[PDB]
Design a protein around this ligand. Structure first.
Ligand SMILES: CCCCCCCCCCCCCCCCCC(=O)OC[C@H](COP(=O)(O)OCCN)OC(=O)CCCCCCCCCCCCCCCCC
Ligand SMILES: CC(C)CCC[C@@H](C)[C@H]1CC[C@H]2[C@@H]3CC=C4C[C@@H](OC(=O)CCC(=O)O)CC[C@]4(C)[C@H]3CC[C@]12C
Ligand SMILES: CC(C)CCC[C@@H](C)[C@H]1CC[C@H]2[C@@H]3CC=C4C[C@@H](OC(=O)CCC(=O)O)CC[C@]4(C)[C@H]3CC[C@]12C
Ligand SMILES: CC(C)CCC[C@@H](C)[C@H]1CC[C@H]2[C@@H]3CC=C4C[C@@H](OC(=O)CCC(=O)O)CC[C@]4(C)[C@H]3CC[C@]12C
Ligand SMILES: CC(C)CCC[C@@H](C)[C@H]1CC[C@H]2[C@@H]3CC=C4C[C@@H](OC(=O)CCC(=O)O)CC[C@]4(C)[C@H]3CC[C@]12C
Ligand SMILES: CC(C)CCC[C@@H](C)[C@H]1CC[C@H]2[C@@H]3CC=C4C[C@@H](OC(=O)CCC(=O)O)CC[C@]4(C)[C@H]3CC[C@]12C
Ligand SMILES: CC(C)CCC[C@@H](C)[C@H]1CC[C@H]2[C@@H]3CC=C4C[C@@H](OC(=O)CCC(=O)O)CC[C@]4(C)[C@H]3CC[C@]12C
Ligand SMILES: *[C@@H]1O[C@H](CO)[C@@H](O)[C@H](O)[C@H]1NC(C)=O
Ligand SMILES: *[C@@H]1O[C@H](CO)[C@@H](O)[C@H](O)[C@H]1NC(C)=O
Ligand SMILES: [Ca+2]
Ligand SMILES: [Ca+2]
Length: 1135
């Protein structure tokens, strides 16, 4: 109409969307300027100007809203409320109007002002690529409810189990005696805490609750041992982490289960529970890890990738002067090119050598060699411009980059006054990048990565929008509420605060990477309210388990003589190797010299070596050592077996050479390390594992180029870190660590000059610190050291140079991009091979599948025995009482059961106890009723043929078993062990399993997982083998590492030390989960008090290599498990 026609031209004008983006970004800038610490009631200048700015922003938002209503209509498809984001704009408009009205009404109510944080989200609609991507995500969300139902199942089951086991157990601190007598000056706290303010609480074990740490393990204070008076412990206090880690409610149990889904703070709460209730809760926590933290979030990855696959496909289916020429000859010689490669490579090596406290001669050699390299590069400059001409030299921009490098180097040499030595020397690293001009594979790989980034960029903007929104939300709700209290005369703010958008964004990025996100979880749950954990739950879930899986999907679909008998010899030698494994898992560094088991271990080594040399001889006489083709050493596995048996022989020889063992103890160490390497022939002696290892290697070449590029970036950033941080990672750890600046001040105080184990002095230490950074573990402390670092021998000061956040976070982003590229390369590599196999066997498989549709035709009507029950008083039972009208009742009763179990907590009302008793009676009675109903509906044939009525009968049998024991405590018929009652209650949870019948999506998805168990099981066996090998190897390397007060541990707390074997298997699992693995490797590399050779040994060479290699192999194995699940899911999508 005419009124509509007046404004449609302006509304449809792209100038309107341009000014919409302008004001959206201006609104983002206005939201970013909030200073929660300083903007107190907005009694400041910038507060007032920002209020005016936001006022104008809301005025324009209201104006554009009314313009679009009066130009497009309301409440219709063509109308304004047609697109989703228009409704969102209306939502912010309404919320802002409400906030403005309450501002007029003089009602502060700082909770609707916390809707401003949603205003940046409007930028999604006013960007085409962003709008398409977000619409695709919103369309793939409704198909994610299945894995969200899996999430609910394996959160609720573990929440019920946790609340039923450890309801309030975490609270029992160790108190003084009940009637305590003190002469005077009562300084004893009511209970015992090792650290101040219950930072590391002392959760005991109750009398009857067979924990481990039971108040007789108290640290003897070292006068009078005041600690021994903490005798009895009772369940009344605040519970650990300022009341944040407990199992009282089911919300708190869900918080803890989430904390172990993200694999952060796993061990701390694990040992909290072990202290509280029982040592055997490791089954609970390890099962939760394996099920949730790996089989859930990676099923989330699989589901998002798949759903985005056919959601891309669905939308896609809707559409569907004479010397100049002579001087060139020297250039294109293919050997001069290699000579300049060698020059550049040795220049890189020269830049890598520099370290802290250089010898005076060494830096001179470095600068002279720099001059030589700059002279050679300038010679190439002048040569190529002459022999080619100006245009030809400038035709290729690689030569332009070379000229830039030469100019910068020359200026650096010339600029010997100031400034040049600070930046241009740091710019020397550009010469490393000249290799791209030469390596042919790293051109194609880099171009492919840029082709990917052609799709990543919009998703990067989406991620930045998301992180900005949540950083603003954090500033709003956590501003000035994270203030750590006074310890030196002032309440210094926590480093992971939310007081400024710089710190807000760094903290939100840190939370997304899952490093010390539990600390901010606790300090935001103990400051505002326990409901503040929803902030972190939403942040982590949308970021990691939705958005990052979305990016993975984006990339994946962007790409897409003597007699010989060999009947059971392999199987029997596999059994022998397993027995060898059993005796390898025993060589703990705790056996007394000459003990009974020591002799057994020696003789077992001898007999196993005899068996292996026997099979060696059998194989070689069957084949021949190297005597022609088809010999013993013509396969990789046979060569490995030969190497292992030869190592065992030479180790036995050296052991028999024990007489005069000096100077060969290192040789014994090396032979023992290879002895740990020994249990690896199971791969050779098994077909499935051998095939899987072959496939794992075949899936490593396609990502080999990306691995080389990422190692090159590690070297580049290592040299950069060496430049930036040389002697700056030294601090005076002492009583004060205050009012002191340089090391001379510390030596005046005589505290200590502590040298961090993670620092950038050498390039090897820089590379180890960079690997710790790039594993998104322990990287926050490294970053804090970087920002704090000041100079060679003075105290780092807090946030001295925040600009180094760029280094420490750009490294994380580049390594993350390369890791996602390795993951997608592995996925697409498996895709090709599995696709071929599919074609072939599935063509034959779709022949028999039409044969199976003919089988259903056959199925037909075999006079189904409904008549036998019809008119037999079951005329209603078989049909009218087995229909979906009767099973909705079962599902409703199950949901009521779920919400009843979700009500148990600590100190619950006894009235509520009896209410749950009656509800449980109701549920059990109706379950028995429906079991009888189906039993009379049909006879014993389908009773076991259904295979699900079996499940219902098992559930009702367990239920009636549980309820009967309750009556025993009413009539006091017999004293029943409370453990049996606990088992019955904790296994009442099995009534959830009946939801699996109607959740046909659960059946489909879990099945799709199930027919991946060939590959998943084989990789799991390989992964257990990796744990075995690396655990034995760690037992011998780090076994003698004593954990005590004299050696204050950081990562190996109580049962994670490498002392025994199993205590090393636990810590290898903990490293595999990436929880405080860097801490553990900090414990391993540690100069001791000369009490053992291990600290003073070559552990610096092998411990970082140990941990790095284990982390890499574990991650690769788990990635290939995920990939196998993904390809089986896509093959199921084919069928
Ligand atoms: C340089 C080599 C890659 C370094 C990248 C890195 O930072 O390693 C840690 C990374 C953390 O894994 P994330 O899923 O991000 O938590 O872990 C990874 O993402 C490593 C996965 C790719 C590593 C491939 C090479 C490892 C050797 C596998 C041999 C298996 C033989 C059997
Ligand atoms: C992934 C879902 C479908 C299955 C999860 C099963 C576990 C959560 C259950 C089954 C076995 C239960 C464990 C069986 C044995 C013990 C030892 C027991 O220790 C003593 O009481 C002594 C404490 C309960 C606990 C940890 C149980 C904790 C909960 C567990 C691990
Ligand atoms: C791969 C190339 C381009 C980089 C150079 C390899 C580095 C990883 C290695 C080789 C030279 C080594 C450095 C040679 C000299 C020393 C001095 C040394 O100081 C001593 O006095 C002993 C400490 C080890 C360090 C820094 C080494 C650290 C590890 C370095 C840098
Ligand atoms: C739906 C969830 C999973 C994602 C959406 C995130 C936010 C919309 C929610 C999740 C966490 C909630 C916060 C949890 C904690 C806080 C502090 C909490 O503490 C207070 O009572 C402060 C009272 C005051 O400041 O006067 C009040 C609710 C609030 C603001 C909540 C506001 C709304 C939040 C940020
Ligand atoms: C399947 C096999 C090839 C690998 C897995 C074997 C482990 C499950 C078993 C085999 C030997 C067992 C170890 C045998 C010896 C020890 C030392 C033992 O501690 C002590 O002897 C000191 C305390 C004391 O002496 O009473 C604790 C059990 C432990 C770690 C056992 C942990 C579990 C182990 C490693
Ligand atoms: C390639 C990325 C994925 C990981 C790189 C792993 C290794 C190549 C790095 C990590 C740990 C580094 C080692 C860490 C410790 C040292 C410091 C330095 O040893 C010293 O302290 C010298 C003084 C002395 O102890 O005598 C020699 C380099 C070295 C072996 C480093 C050599 C290079 C290592 C093995
Ligand atoms: C991925 C999953 C399958 C790894 C399985 C882990 C268990 C095989 C490890 C982890 C915890 C270890 C336990 C940690 C503590 C000890 C105490 C130790 O000495 C007491 C005896 C071995 C034992 C039971 C360990 C036995 C082997 C355990 C159960
Ligand atoms: C440190 O220096 C300050 C200077 O202001 C002084 O007041 C203080 O007594 C010194 N010592 C300690 C332990 O703080
Ligand atoms: C180190 O700090 C002290 C503080 O008393 C100062 O006097 C001195 O100049 C500083 N620098 C040195 C010792 O090189
Ligand atoms: Ca982690
Ligand atoms: Ca951590």
């Amino acid at each position: 109409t005419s009124p509509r026609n007046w404004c449609i031209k302006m509304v449809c004008n792209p100038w309107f969307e341009c000014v919409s983006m302008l004001v959206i970004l201006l609104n983002c800038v206005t939201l970013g300027m909030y200073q929660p610490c300083d903007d107190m009631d907005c009694l400041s200048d910038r507060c007032k100007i920002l209020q005016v700015f936001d006022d104008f922003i809301f005025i324009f938002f209201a104006m554009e809203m009314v313009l679009k209503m009066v130009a497009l209509g309301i409440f219709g498809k063509k109308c304004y409320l047609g697109d989703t984001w228009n409704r969102l704009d209306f939502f912010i408009v309404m919320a802002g109007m409400v906030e403005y009205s309450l501002d007029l009404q003089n009602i502060n109510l700082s909770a609707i002002r916390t809707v401003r944080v949603l205003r940046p989200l409007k930028a999604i609609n006013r960007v085409p690529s962003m709008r398409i991507l977000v619409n695709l995500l919103l369309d793939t969300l409704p198909m994610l409810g299945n894995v969200l139902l899996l999430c609910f199942f394996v959160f609720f089951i573990f929440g019920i189990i946790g609340v039923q086991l450890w309801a309030g157990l975490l609270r029992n601190r160790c108190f003084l005696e009940e009637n305590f007598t003190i002469q005077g000056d009562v300084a004893l706290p009511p209970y015992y805490q090792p650290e101040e303010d219950d930072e590391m609480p002392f959760i005991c074990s109750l009398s009857g609750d067979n924990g481990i740490m039971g108040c007789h393990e108290i640290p003897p204070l070292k006068c009078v041992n005041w600690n021994r008076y903490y005798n009895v412990c009772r369940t009344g206090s605040a519970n650990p982490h300022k009341g944040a880690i407990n199992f009282d409610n089911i919300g708190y149990a869900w918080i803890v289960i989430f904390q172990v889904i993200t694999l952060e703070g796993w061990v701390e709460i694990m040992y909290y529970v072990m202290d509280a209730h029982s040592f055997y809760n490791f089954i609970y926590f390890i099962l939760l890890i394996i099920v949730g933290s790996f089989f859930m979030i990676n099923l989330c990855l699989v589901v998002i990738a798949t759903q985005f696959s056919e959601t891309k496909q669905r939308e896609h289916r809707l559409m569907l002067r004479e010397t100049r020429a002579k001087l060139r000859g020297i250039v294109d010689s293919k050997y001069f090119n290699r000579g300049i490669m060698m020059a550049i490579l040795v220049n890189t090596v020269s830049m890598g050598i520099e370290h802290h406290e250089q010898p005076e001669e060494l830096t001179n050699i470095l600068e002279i060699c720099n001059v030589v390299f700059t002279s050679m590069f300038a010679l190439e400059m002048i040569l190529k411009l002459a022999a080619f001409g100006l245009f030809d030299y400038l035709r290729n921009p690689y030569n332009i980059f070379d000229s830039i490098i030469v100019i910068i180097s020359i200026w650096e040499i010339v600029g010997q006054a100031d400034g040049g030595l600070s930046v241009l020397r740091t710019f020397r690293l550009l010469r490393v990048l000249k290799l791209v001009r030469f390596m042919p594979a790293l051109r194609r790989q880099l171009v492919v990565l840029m082709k990917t980034m052609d799709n990543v960029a919009t998703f990067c903007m989406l991620l930045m929008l998301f992180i900005f929104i949540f950083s603003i939300l954090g500033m709003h709700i956590f501003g000035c509420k994270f203030s750590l209290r006074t310890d030196t005369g002032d309440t210094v703010p926590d480093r992971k605060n939310f007081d400024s958008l710089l710190w807000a964004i760094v903290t939100v990025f840190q939370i997304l990477t899952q490093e010390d996100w539990n600390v901010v979880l606790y300090n935001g749950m103990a400051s505002t309210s326990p409901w503040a954990s929803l902030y972190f739950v939403a942040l982590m879930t949308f970021g990691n388990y939705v958005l990052f899986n979305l990016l993975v999907a984006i990339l994946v679909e962007g790409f897409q003589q003597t007699i010989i008998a060999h009947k059971l010899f392999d199987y029997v030698v596999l059994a022998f190797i397993f027995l060898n494994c059993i005796t390898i898992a025993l060589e703990r560094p705790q056996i007394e010299a000459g003990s009974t088991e020591r002799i057994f271990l020696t003789v077992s080594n001898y007999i196993f070596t005899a068996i292996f040399v026997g099979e060696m001889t059998l194989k070689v006489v069957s084949l021949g050592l190297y005597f022609g083709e088809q010999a013993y050493l013509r396969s990789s596995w046979n060569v490995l077996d030969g190497f292992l048996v030869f190592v065992s022989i030479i180790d036995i020889v050296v052991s028999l050479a024990s007489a005069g063992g000096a100077k060969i103890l290192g040789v014994l160490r090396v032979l023992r390390l290879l002895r740990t390497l020994r249990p690896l022939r199971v791969i050779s002696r098994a077909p499935g594992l051998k095939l899987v290892v072959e496939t794992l290697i075949s899936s490593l070449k396609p990502i080999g180029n990306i691995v080389l590029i990422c190692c090159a970036f590690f070297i580049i950033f290592g040299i950069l870190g060496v430049q930036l941080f040389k002697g700056k990672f030294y601090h005076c750890l002492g009583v004060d660590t205050r009012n002191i600046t340089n090391r001379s001040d510390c030596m005046a105080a005589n505290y200590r000059w502590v040298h961090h184990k993670y620092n950038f002095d050498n390039l090897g230490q820089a590379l180890m610190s960079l690997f710790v950074l790039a594993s998104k573990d322990g990287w926050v402390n490294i970053m804090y050291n970087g920002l704090d670092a000041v100079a060679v021998d003075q105290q780092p000061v807090t946030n001295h140079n925040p600009w180094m956040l760029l280094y420490f976070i750009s490294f994380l982003l580049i390594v993350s991009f390369f890791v996602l590229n390795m993951f997608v390369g592995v996925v697409v590599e498996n895709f090709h091979k599995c696709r071929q196999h599919q074609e072939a066997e599935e063509a034959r498989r779709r022949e028999e599948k039409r044969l199976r549709r003919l089988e259903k035709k056959r199925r037909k009507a075999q006079r189904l025995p409904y008549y036998a029950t019809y008119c037999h008083t079951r005329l209603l039972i078989h049909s009218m009482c087995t229909s979906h009208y009767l099973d909705i009742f079962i599902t409703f009763i199950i949901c009521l059961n779920v919400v009843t179990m979700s009500l148990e907590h600590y100190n619950q009302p006894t009235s509520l106890e009896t209410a749950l008793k009656y509800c449980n009676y109701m549920f059990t009675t109706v379950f028995v009723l429906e079991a009888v109903l189906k039993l009379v509906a049909f006879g014993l044939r389908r009773f076991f043929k259904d295979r699900w009525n079996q499940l219902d009968l098992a559930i009702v049998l367990l239920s009636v078993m549980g309820i009967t024991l309750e009556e025993i405590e009413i009539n006091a018929a017999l004293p029943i062990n409370p453990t049996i009652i606990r088992i019955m209650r904790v296994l009442r949870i099995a009534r959830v399993l009946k939801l699996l019948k109607m959740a046909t999506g659960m059946r489909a998805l879990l099945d799709t997982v199930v027919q991946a168990l060939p590959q998943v099981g084989n990789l799991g066996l390989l992964f257990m083998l990796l744990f075995f090998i690396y655990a034995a190897l760690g037992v011998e390397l780090f076994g003698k590492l004593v954990c005590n007060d004299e050696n204050p541990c950081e990562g190996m707390s109580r049962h994670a030390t490498f002392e025994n074997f199993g205590m090393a298997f636990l810590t290898l699992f903990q490293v595999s989960t990436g929880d405080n693995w860097n801490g553990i490797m900090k414990d391993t590399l540690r100069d001791c008090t000369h009490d053992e050779r291990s600290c003073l040994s070559s552990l610096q060479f092998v411990s970082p290599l140990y941990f790095v290699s284990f982390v890499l192999t574990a991650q690769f194995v788990l990635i290939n498990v995920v990939v196998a699940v993904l390809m089986k899911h896509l093959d199921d999508s084919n069928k």
